[PDB]
Design an enzyme around this catalytic site. Structure first.
Site, short mmCIF file in Angstrom:
data_model
loop_
_atom_site.label_atom_id
_atom_site.label_comp_id
_atom_site.label_asym_id
_atom_site.label_seq_id
_atom_site.Cartn_x
_atom_site.Cartn_y
_atom_site.Cartn_z
CD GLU A 146 -6.66 0.77 5.12
OE1 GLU A 146 -7.11 0.33 6.19
OE2 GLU A 146 -5.95 0.08 4.36
CG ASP A 203 -6.79 -6.90 6.31
OD1 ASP A 203 -7.47 -5.91 6.69
OD2 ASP A 203 -5.72 -6.79 5.66
CD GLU A 256 -2.37 -1.24 2.90
OE1 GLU A 256 -1.81 -0.74 3.90
OE2 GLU A 256 -3.52 -1.72 2.95
CD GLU A 274 -6.30 -2.99 1.87
OE1 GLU A 274 -6.68 -1.96 2.47
OE2 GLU A 274 -5.75 -3.94 2.45
CA LIG Z 1 -5.27 -2.23 4.60
#
Ligand SMILES: [Ca+2]
Length: 641
Positions: free
Chosen positions: A449, A394, A153, A443
């Site tokens: 987020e 996750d 990310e 993701e």
């Molecule tokens: Ca995340």
């Protein structure tokens, strides 16, 4: 020396079998990629690619339609010229030339079990081109084993190849600007039971080199609330192989206009074929999400939190607007236990699932990696039989062979019990959604987020116009948009319990068209949605899966306009960067009948008050030329029925 050209002849790759196995890329006569070496080193000392021995070659020309359910169109066109190189020793290299890309993959036809120590996949450019890459966010420079443990990310860093951090890995996809409008997007697909490919600027000049996370020899429970399996020790090889198999495709998307980059289907086309016959139980849709907005409802008579009356409210809000799902994010299972069978005192799963069912709402359960795969078969069977529709797994934070193998095993296990899957804390899709259509989202994206804690220096608006041309090239994203609190330039601030997005209201709305998310979130509180009837009605009605998609126009990191069709209804979404811009929507993609349009455009003060928007209705036809103004960090959403 072997040549292969794309069906239209404007893209070609020259393959040379000499002391090294190299392939270059030429676009419209211009060499955008100089001869680049490729190879695989086995534990027995063999090196496919080094002084290779060619035994035979076979060419082919294919043009067909690949069915693509729960995605951007009912089907995608697969048009190319293939060149397979067979080498003495039971190994091949397949090459394909599409009009928008060059791709290759190693194929193991050997019957004897062995191991891969390392793999070479270099990308040598003719000059110091400007690259846009997503650095691994964690670990320290130079300590690669420290970097292999990451979320995948991160925002993009744009700079010349020569100025990139030579000690930090870059995950895929990534783009290299070849100049003159030509772009090269590097990614990989069919990433099953093999380590993910990272790129590095540590070697040579104007050269991106590969690296893979080593195979794990010892993992220990820990991390995020003891739901992760950290790699403490690793083997001296990257992957185990004991059967003939195809290895992941290394894809070099090449485009002459940015809209073709955003539209390329290569990732899906090169994913392993579907292993599912019955798809009638897979239900794509949206979620009245709980986590992003921190369960922060107002106007209710009970204390909000991970408890029954709170989820009932989300279920009622979802049902009231025909929204399909409600996720029970992290919090329903007793913390630190990493046991999916231990539900907290405040939650009565059975009651919630059945209540939701009577309201036409499905339930999805969030689960940390370890707690899910430690007893996967039992977990899937148990919850499937009580009515649960799927899982959101996750915190894997790894892409070594064992974890990538996990993605497919979980996908299959969920498919077995008719459960959909959403993977978070993972890497780019790389084709998994084609192989197992029940994995509706992934993701591996710096989503909304991040607005819950990021400093103002994180430019979310800029990121939004980057990913459609990069991360999304690999496949669907669970970005989780839908914020009703909208901050114009300089008004953003991280707020954990009352988060906002950067830019305008219409930007959020446009993302439901611009971003592809079969399993899509409504990130805000039902309370905020109920205060916004018009916005909510548009979001609730818009499809998450399409029959046809057309990227009308766009420039990487600047703007994009996309039109998608579902049945006979068309949707158009557009977003811009921090610069205001005027866009013209040529509606030639429409049919011949008379249509009624509903348009959400930025309000005239959207540059000072991000929430400002205007809704308009008017008749429109195939010849229409819709002029629309986008405020800074804004955009528009259009419905044509
Ligand atoms: Ca995340």
């Amino acid at each position: 020396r072997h040549m292969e050209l794309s069906p239209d002849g404007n893209l070609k790759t020259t393959i040379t079998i000499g002391d090294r196995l190299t392939y270059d890329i030429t676009c419209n006569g211009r060499q955008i990629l100089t001869p680049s070496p490729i190879s695989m080193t086995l534990d027995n000392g063999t090196v496919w690619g080094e002084n290779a021995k060619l035994s035979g070659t076979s060419r082919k020309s294919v043009d067909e339609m690949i069915p693509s359910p729960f995605y951007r169109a009912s089907e995608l066109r697969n048009h190319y010229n293939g060149l397979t190189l067979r080498f003495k020793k039971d190994w091949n290299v397949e090459f394909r030339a599409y009009n928008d890309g060059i791709a290759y993959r190693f194929v193991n036809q050997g019957k004897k079990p062995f191991r891969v120590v390392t793999e070479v996949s270099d990308y040598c450019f003719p000059s110091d081109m400007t690259a846009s890459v997503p650095y691994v966010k964690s670990g320290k420079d130079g300590d690669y084993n420290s970097q292999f443990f990451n979320s995948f990310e991160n925002t993009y860093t744009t700079d010349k190849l020569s100025k990139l951090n030579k000690q930090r890995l870059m995950f895929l996809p990534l783009v290299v600007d070849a100049g003159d409008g030509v772009k090269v997007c590097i990614t990989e697909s069919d990433l099953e039971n093999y380590p993910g490919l990272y790129l590095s600027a540590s070697e040579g000049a104007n050269r991106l080199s590969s690296m893979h996370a080593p195979y794990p020899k010892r993992t220990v429970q820990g991390g995020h609330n003891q739901l992760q399996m950290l790699v403490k020790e690793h083997e001296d090889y990257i992957a185990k192989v004991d059967k003939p198999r195809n290895f992941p495709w290394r894809i070099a998307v090449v485009t002459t206009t940015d809209k073709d980059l955003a539209a390329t289907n290569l990732s899906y086309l090169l994913g392993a074929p579907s292993r599912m016959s019955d798809l009638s139980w897979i239900k794509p849709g949206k979620v009245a999400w709980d986590w992003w907005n921190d369960w922060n409802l107002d106007g209710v008579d009970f204390v909000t939190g991970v408890n029954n009356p709170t989820y009932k409210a989300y279920i009622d809000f979802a049902s009231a607007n025909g929204i399909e799902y409600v996720i029970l994010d992290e919090g329903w299972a007793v913390n630190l236990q990493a046991d999916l069978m231990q539900v907290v005192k405040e939650i009565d799963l059975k009651e919630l699932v059945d209540y939701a069912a009577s309201k036409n709402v499905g339930i999805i359960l969030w689960a940390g990696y370890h707690a899910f795969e430690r007893d996967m078969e039992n977990v899937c069977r148990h919850y499937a039989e009580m009515g649960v529709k799927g899982f959101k797994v996750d915190f894997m934070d790894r892409d070594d062979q064992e974890m990538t193998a996990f993605n497919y095993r979980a996908a299959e296990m969920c498919a077995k019990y008719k459960l959909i899957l959403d993977l978070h804390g993972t890497h780019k899709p790389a084709g998994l959604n084609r192989t197992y259509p029940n994995v509706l989202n992934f993701e591996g994206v710096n989503g909304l987020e991040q607005m819950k804690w990021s400093s103002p220096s994180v430019d979310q608006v800029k990121y939004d116009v980057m990913i459609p041309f990069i991360r999304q090239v690999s496949g669907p994203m669970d970005y989780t948009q839908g914020a009703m609190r909208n901050a114009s330039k300089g008004n953003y601030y991280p707020c954990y319990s009352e988060p906002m997005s950067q830019g305008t209201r219409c930007r959020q709305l446009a993302l439901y068209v611009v971003f592809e998310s079969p399993f899509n979130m409504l990130c805000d509180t039902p309370s905020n949605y109920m205060r916004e009837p018009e916005s909510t009605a548009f979001i609730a009605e818009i499809p998450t899966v399409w029959d046809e998609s057309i990227v009308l126009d766009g420039k990487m990191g600047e703007y994009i306009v996309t039109a998608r069709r579902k049945g006979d209804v068309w949707y158009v979404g557009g977003i811009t960067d921090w610069s205001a811009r005027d866009i013209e929507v040529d509606c030639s993609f429409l049919g011949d009948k008379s249509y009624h349009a509903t348009l959400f455009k930025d309000g005239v003060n959207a540059h000072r008050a991000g929430r400002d928007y205007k809704c308009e209705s008017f008749p429109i036809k195939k010849d229409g030329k819709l002029k629309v103004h986008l405020a800074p960090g804004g955009g528009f959403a259009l419905k044509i029925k």
